Design a protein around this ligand. Structure first.
Ligand SMILES: Cc1cc2nc3[nH]c(=O)[nH]c(=O)c3nc2cc1C
Ligand SMILES: [Mg+2]
Length: 277
């Protein structure tokens, strides 16, 4: 099979390059296509990891739009020798498509080189470069932490997204799940809210330390022109623009005022977008 192998956290434009190339290679080699997505990169378990751009589930759903997608369980492959990885995951595979410096097996002893020696052809995909920077999940995770959401589409191929369930003064508190995900810079954001039933609304989302565990961040959105409790429902939010830093108000009024100011600003932004016919 022609098999793409990588993490693909975020499925950014560099990943899309790998996947499109795999499909073309599959077409001319007349082989089938398969994407192996490693559940977590090794850095994920280290203390300073910023967090994934999205859950593995969201990721697989996106990868699946390109080809059959199989998750490689980090815990199941980290200890394998290069030999055992090939024997167990690449039997009958004649070609793999991976990014440069791809590594595998315990102590990262496996590489494209080793694969070629086992008769596998390896197509190493060069990184995609955007405005002088190499597109990578790390770069995108850093933009999220710096709240630089308008610059994200040029690297990710779309706006950064926050996703989760509600709950678990009307705002929807988004539970993003139990996976370690990158957090947006604390503050207020203009968001496009994809509700269930296909409706799309705009929202003003606040991101703030709500300690209650420490690097614990809360995501609550005030959806514009929408009532009805989405409590228990799944939401997806495109993070469009950083509006203002988080603030420490001195009691239920200047907050209200600040919020009112956020919505007002949002309304103006939306109206600007609309007028850009
Ligand atoms: C819905 C909403 C809640 C907020 N909570 C907030 N809470 C807080 O302690 N500081 C803030 O700056 C803040 N901003 C908010 C902005 C919005 C739009
Ligand atoms: Mg061969």
């Amino acid at each position: 099979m022609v098999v793409s192998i990588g993490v693909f956290d975020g499925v950014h434009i560099g990943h899309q390059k790998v996947l499109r190339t795999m499909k073309e290679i599959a077409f001319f080699r007349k082989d089938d296509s398969l994407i192996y997505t490693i559940s977590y990169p090794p850095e994920y378990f280290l203390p300073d990891f910023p967090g994934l751009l999205m859950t593995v589930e969201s990721r697989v759903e996106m990868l699946s739009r390109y080809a059959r997608t199989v998750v490689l369980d980090f815990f199941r492959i980290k200890d394998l020798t290069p030999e055992g990885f090939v024997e167990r995951y690449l039997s009958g595979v004649s070609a793999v498509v991976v990014g440069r410096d791809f590594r595998f097996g315990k102590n990262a002893s496996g590489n494209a080189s080793f694969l070629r020696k086992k008769g596998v052809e390896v197509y190493e995909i060069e990184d995609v470069v955007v405005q002088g920077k190499r597109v990578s999940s790390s770069l995108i995770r850093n933009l999220v932490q710096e709240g630089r959401v308008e610059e994200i589409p040029a690297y990710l191929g779309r706006y950064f997204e926050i996703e989760g369930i509600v709950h678990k003064f009307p705002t929807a508190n988004i539970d993003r799940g139990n996976e370690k995900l990158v957090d947006l810079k604390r503050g207020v954001y203009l968001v496009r809210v994809h509700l269930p039933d296909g409706k799309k609304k705009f929202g003003v989302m606040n991101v703030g330390f709500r300690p209650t565990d420490a690097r614990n961040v809360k995501y609550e959105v005030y959806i514009l022109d929408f009532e009805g409790d989405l409590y228990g429902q799944r939401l997806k939010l495109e993070v469009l623009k950083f509006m203002r830093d988080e603030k420490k108000f001195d009691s239920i009024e200047e907050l209200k005022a600040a919020i009112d100011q956020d919505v007002k600003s949002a309304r103006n932004m939306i109206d600007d977008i609309i007028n850009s016919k």
